[PDB]
Structures are given as structure tokens and as C-alpha cells.
Design a protein around this ligand. Sequence first.
Ligand SMILES: OC[C@H]1O[C@@H](O[C@H]2[C@H](O)[C@@H](O)[C@@H](O)O[C@@H]2CO)[C@H](O)[C@@H](O)[C@H]1O
Length: 147
Amino acid sequence: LQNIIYNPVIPFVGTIPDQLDPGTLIVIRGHVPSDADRFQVDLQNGSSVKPRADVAFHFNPRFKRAGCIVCNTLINEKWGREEITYDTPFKREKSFEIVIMVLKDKFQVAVNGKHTLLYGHRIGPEKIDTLGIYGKVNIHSIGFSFS
Ligand SMILES: OC[C@H]1O[C@@H](O[C@H]2[C@H](O)[C@@H](O)[C@@H](O)O[C@@H]2CO)[C@H](O)[C@@H](O)[C@H]1O
């Protein structure tokens, strides 16, 4: 892996040091605290807060009740149509590895070595230059594999 970041402070907002071309991997290892309600990994067009940076891919594990993962896109401060995955591999008090693979028409995400979901591009992946991680999560490392 390339351009590795260790033990970042959350919230983390960092520049992605190269293009997200097809085959590019974003690898995030961490653990979920016992009191987690939710956390999110956001692939963003910049880091503006006013107006809020568009979020090409919002990947949002939620932990209340049975749990789920919500995915969405934010364009001009409006959320689009949510895509919900009910078969969530995340658990409070457990470590994880998220691998996001960028493909031509979509993202593919695997967690703990098992395929989890797909998310079709709504914003051109060329516009993504920023990785945001927010919420109740502890991140051990972030790494990239650029194609
Ligand atoms: O879609 C991603 C965003 O969801 C927002 O919450 C939604 C909620 O998921 C939905 O069920 C409904 O109640 O509308 C809410 C407001 O749009 C979160 O606030 C936001 O952080 C994103 O996760």
C-alpha cells in the first residue's frame, strides 16, 4: 500500500494523493467503539464546509437495532436517493477492514474479505480528491493502491 496514514484523529479530512482510476483501492482498518451509533467514510470533491463539499460516495454504517449500511451522494448540499444494505458485517467492539475498489461505472466495497456492496457513480470519480472519515469509529490505518 501507498501513502499510508496511521492512527489519524477523527474527524479525518485528507487529500487523496492520486487519481481514483479503475482498479484503485482505498483500504481502511479500524474498530467500532461499544457506544457507536454510526460512522461514515466520505469520498469528497474538496473539503469546503460552506458550501459543504459534494460527497461522491457516502458509506455510512449504522448500528442501532439490527444495523445496516446507508450509501448516498451529496450534490449542492442535498442528499440523493439512499441505497441501503441490510447485510452489514460491522459490529460494535469489533475490528474491521474496508476495501473500496473504484471501477469504471461503480464502487465495489468488501469488508473483512467479503463482498459487501456496489454503488454506481453519480459524480465523476475524477472530481474526488478528498477522504473524510467522521463519527464514532477508531481508525488504525488508511492506505491506497493506485492503478
Ligand atoms: O442519506 C445519507 C444521509 O442520511 C441522513 O439521514 C436521513 C435518514 O437516513 C433518512 O432515513 C431520513 O430520515 O432522512 C434523513 C435526513 O436526510 C443523515 O442526516 C446524513 O448524515 C446522511 O447519513
